[model samples]
Target: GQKIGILGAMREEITPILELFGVDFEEIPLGGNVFHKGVYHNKEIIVAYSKIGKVHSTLTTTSMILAFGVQKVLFSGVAGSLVKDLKINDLLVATQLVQHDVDLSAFDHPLGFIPESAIFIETSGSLNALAKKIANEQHIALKEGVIASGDQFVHSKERKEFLVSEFKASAVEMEGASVAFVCQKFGVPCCVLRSISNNADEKAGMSFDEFLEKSAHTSAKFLKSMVDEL
Candidate 1:
């Protein structure tokens, strides 16, 4: 059986899914994170909480590839909506990810281009298609678009507008782009599914706190369905 890795940015984001169906897994600790390995609907899978932000996510993704030998990776988490049309509770499946905070213009490289690396990292097309199909089958509204990632928790209208204007991103979060970057480096199939928890504005923090658990659970439910289909 092929081994797959599922990652979430916080404990709340991953706990629900494990509580729902990870009763038979063995918890293996590695590099400050716990990896749950078990069979779900006949598919072998590994689940981990990557903590928060870009660095932690990158480390988790690298470990999933190098240590656990996962063939594919999926990130399930929450994000702040960048577009006015996407409201809280809505879900986005990333088609591509770009680091909004990355600027290498001094090296004559375009913005968002990490030197010697890809400028725009794309999600696995087949995995993206499968996620869309699962969303449709489950009757969950899913938006397919670009997701911007940065280490900072975006909470200003100007920053949100900049991300949207610069990259045409539909969602903004801390970990998606970094996970995409690491997965791309290892040539692994990866996809990110995010639930919009707030608008990326001054009120983002309060709104996120209010909807954190619910948003996490929603994303987890959808992710579980996707894994079952896989």
Candidate 2:
């Protein structure tokens, strides 16, 4: 039977949950990244952080799937709010993902349209429903929608507007879509949940960094519990 896997992009996004699980993990170092394989709440769990980009994530995620043979992979991280209604600290369950930076428009394809690949990659319905149920149980006001991923930090207003109009993405981040792409190729289910850290158009660095720890902690709470349910 395939086990469960947890992934994120930063230390705060994973370590707090690891502390909660209290599992002395076996470190599996592959491709210059570490996978903390262990058992959590009676389920075998593998935790990893793909560093932060399409290249790093696709590589790390592919390794986690092929090497561990996990049934489902869960990605928990912080993202900038693409829409105004979704403010800081809001929880968003990504139903599908698009690579906002993907441009094939020269060939008449849409911004995110890749030939032989879907423009909008939907996440697993079962896993997404499960995540919503967990959010309900925890009384978290979670919103479900599209999350756009790219290599950019997304601090410009014009670019943010373009992404919103182009992708209708609720949250903009750096890694979810690549992970989603890898998971789909491997025939494994994946779920991405995020906590809003800042508005994409805001004064970027210091403000976002301030809420980084809080957002990761907020999202990791649900992530830790979902492993138990899974």
Which prediction has the highest lDDT against the true structure?
1
Per-residue lDDT of 44-95 in model 1, one digit per residue for the tens? 8899999999889998899989999999998899999989889899988999
Q: What TM-score does candidate 1 reach?
A: 0.96
Backbone clash count, each prediction separately: 0, 0
CA deviation > 4 Å runs, candidate 2: none
Stretch of 10 with least lDDT, candidate 2: 199-208
Error of 1 at 113 (Å): 1.3
Q: Candidate 2 lDDT, tens digit per residue, 59-92?
A: 9898998898888999999999988889899999
Question: How much does candidate 2 score in TM-score?
Answer: 0.97
